[model samples]
Target: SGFRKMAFPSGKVEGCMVQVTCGTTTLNGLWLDDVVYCPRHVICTSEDMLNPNYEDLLIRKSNHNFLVQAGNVQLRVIGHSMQNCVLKLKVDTANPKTPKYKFVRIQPGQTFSVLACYNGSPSGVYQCAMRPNFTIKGSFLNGSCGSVGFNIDYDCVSFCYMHHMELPTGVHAGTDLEGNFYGPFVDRQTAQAAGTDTTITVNVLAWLYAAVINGDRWFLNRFTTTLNDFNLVAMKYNYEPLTQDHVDILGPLSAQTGIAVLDMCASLKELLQNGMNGRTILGSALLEDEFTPFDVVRQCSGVT
Candidate 1:
């Protein structure tokens, strides 16, 4: 007989068996898309677990009024939506080398529906994902080797934002006489003692470089002069100086582009850009793609 694939919810029963009914039909096969449905009495179910066949099991179920165990792999669905969507479950257990999965369909509004079943006990990391033409979200219980079962709901942008940051900023700012790449810590430090020269030299050089590339050296010079007049502005505002939050935010931003790093610091991005652009902007190759802050988070979380 031709067999059809079908998926049932977690507790749904199937298979050609007599145990399910007293004298009529039996279930042939059961999975998400393909299910062999027959009348209740004609099937059998009184068979051993180690046996490779299911014929006798259907007959037993028909006579005994009990549903036989479907398979080891069981589906426990977490959540879903009824608005124009589909959900399925699958399992793979065979030839330890390459196990195969059997998926089953899920109806839109059913409270507890089955997705699939396999020969032996089901265990392993199963991917439960939904593909949307636009945006979507949901949650699922992840089988795990770790502490708690993970729950996640994320949109497509959450997936793509991690990529956009990697597209390269497009300029390889140069280096000082002695080559050194500037780190993210770019702010200047002030000396409490008089005439104790601070490393503003780096900042001055960075300004010069920016001015040159920007073709506006005059404005860069004017900004530097204005920075020195902080005391004059302080008196005008009748305030002593600054506060905590102001310093934390303003300090890092001011320093990031300051003389401390870039004027002395060669950019990793610019370095790559220059190498590639030099070779027709093809750029020097990297072992892997550039990562964004979010990518770092995902990497740390072991997603990739």
Candidate 2:
């Protein structure tokens, strides 16, 4: 549910390896280099651009004995045999000779899936085989043996799993990465007595920024409206709400780099470029609380 390291394998495979690279929301962060990328839904890659219901590239078709299908960053094995069976599947992306093994015992109608990422980029070749077994009569039985190899080419963006992941907290504007502000008062009366505190404003800003960057269109407008009001308040009292500060911060860049926000794409580009800063500004106000962008995005994106 949180940030996890994803690896891309070496481009040594023969076929056009399915190249996978993840988007900003897919990875939740920017890529570091070729091999190391900062990085799913239910048995699928959680992408920002593609439909979540889409199936992954079929690396191998299921045989008569073993039904294997390639999932987004995973592999699924279903037992379709007449008898209950014990299956041993080996995935080898690095070395064809020695492969990483997965063991599953499935009922006739059950299915088992495993993570396709053993070691990252050019993905690996995989094969499945049924383990040896015995009957009630004490006779030897051998199941069918099958192996298949496939390669994932370059330039494939990945979508990672996101359910119950945590977001950054305790942020403030104009401070460095680990900025701090005012009280984390436990009692409401105490906070009220404190009078005209900036804590709540800051916390709200952080949450709002997170919602914006996650491409959460559902609450995006709501948060934007709230921030718009905060901007007016900040301007009225000459206090910084940080939202306008960010807008102004990007203003000069828009003029100088010829990257003006002419359309939705430009706005998204600016948001993606400065999302961490915006998130930090809001997080500085949150004061060590737990929240996740996934929760917001999942719920908000569902709205029409």
Candidate 3:
């Protein structure tokens, strides 16, 4: 008999058996075993494998449940109408008291990202819902409604940390040079006065770098691990995507340096934009204390 390929969710296709039945006939076997679906109990040979509708017989016998690695869940919205429209959405999780209710305008061919959270048993399933109502050109499109449902299981600490990190902004949205919105405590005296432990800072940065190198989408979704230098330069000169060979020399210099340098430059720009002093706080605080920004920038500069 020809071996049939079984389709299961990613990370789940081993040491499990599935039961196939039709009209009181039952066959059980491992997914990888040389077994084929028999639609009619009348046939007892490999001939049954050729049943025309055998495709429908393959069923998921293993746990088809999705577990949330941490308390985090993500929702993405696309504008399907091909017209500029605003969507009013009510985002809810297992926790009813703190549902995120908001309005977003999505341009044609654009996607809007929303992150939500749930608090409950790690092994138990939690529900997240997205209810969207559309309005176009100042007119609300009534009588039509759309909703999406997500079943989540928070089975790991990673999910919880990611949820907390992304809850405020779907993206990193790095803090001001003073670390006003979040931490690593850029202000040394302030950090010391608050009794911030250095070990905690180190551990967080270590975990984040590991996630970045491994391309963990869960972490990357909350934090940016890459940058487009060309776009950054263009934005600096106004919203025009122009390549002036004269000033474009800085583009390659910027791109070749990678994440840490880009972050340092961003922090410096933020300070300078606000009319702060010439010296920017370029250190580990931006990345929660992974490595000093100066050292990383210096290393990149030396890599002739």
Candidate 4:
């Protein structure tokens, strides 16, 4: 829950190094986003999933300790090494049996630091590093000033965690280094059972941290948290109720930092090259509040 900034790694390590990046979202009546270009690692696993229920297992043959570690542990997306550092393990996983949650690191003692970022800079700081499964809370990234894009002074919110740790039950679509949306990727449980890596699963989280830091909470992140909130927005898209595709469009507009930590991937090419404006989301939502939760219409609307 705190941020630590150790010196950036001069040499490379074995685990993945990650940083959260922002696209477009706004505050102060303006839009903000950065075209941050840095690679992120993806992981998938199944054997570790307890085959669905971890209700009665005493222990396992061996456990994989997954965490995002580095010397600096900072974020620039706006923008790792090994045994010398490691994951302490706690809070990320609901179950305590997977990885032994005794100490912070087994490899590097304390040479590097982990960070939590906001508004294109560091905000919340943590002493030890974060587990592969952690929540980044933020909303609408509007650093809508100066030059924003590939060439800027911004650093990505970086860390290296496992993609397999994701708790998905269905296939997903992800983007590539070139330009194309591809999918039918395995779900989390099956993925880890296979055990692989090296791609960032696109989700609202990428820009979420920045948005929450932008002083957004109720309006931008979670429409589902309340009645009419999530549905009303879906109605605007004609995209469908709880549709998988609409999320990427509302990417920045959500405040609870965009629904469940999910693999909601939308192509930047379609967002930009094809001429779609995220501004439209906010534009119309402002026109309507749709607070149906207060109504008892359903209770009274009968033959009477």
lDDT values, one for every candidate: 0.22, 0.23, 0.22, 0.23
Q: What are the per-residue Cα lDDT tens digits for candidate 4 across 12-91?
A: 11112232221222101001122221211111123434343222221221112222212234322111111111111222
The CA lDDT at 296 in model 4 is: 12
**Model 1 lowest lDDT segment of ten:** 157-166
Candidate 3 local lDDT, residue 56: 32
Off by over 4 Å in 4: 1-46, 50-237, 240-304
RMSD of each: 25.3, 22.5, 24.0, 20.3
> What is the C-alpha RMSD, rounded to one decimal, of candidate 3?
24.0
Q: Cα lDDT for residue 29, model 2?
A: 11
CA displacement after TM-score superposition, residue 281 of candidate 2 (Å): 17
Residue-level lDDT tens digits of model 1 in 1-304: 1111111211212221111122332221222222211222122223332231233343233212322223433223222111111111122221122212222221111111122222222222221211111101112121110000111223110111000000022211111111111111101121211121112222223222333333332222222222234424433433233223323422332353453222122232232224333221112132111211222233223442
How many residue pairs of model 4 clash at the backbone? 52
| TM-score, cand. 1 vs. native | 0.18
lDDT of 2 at 302: 43
Candidate with better lDDT, 1 vs 3: 3
Estimate, for each residue in 159-242, the C-alpha lDDT of model 3 and write its tens digit. Answer: 110111111112221111111222221211121122212221221222233333334312222222123553463255332232
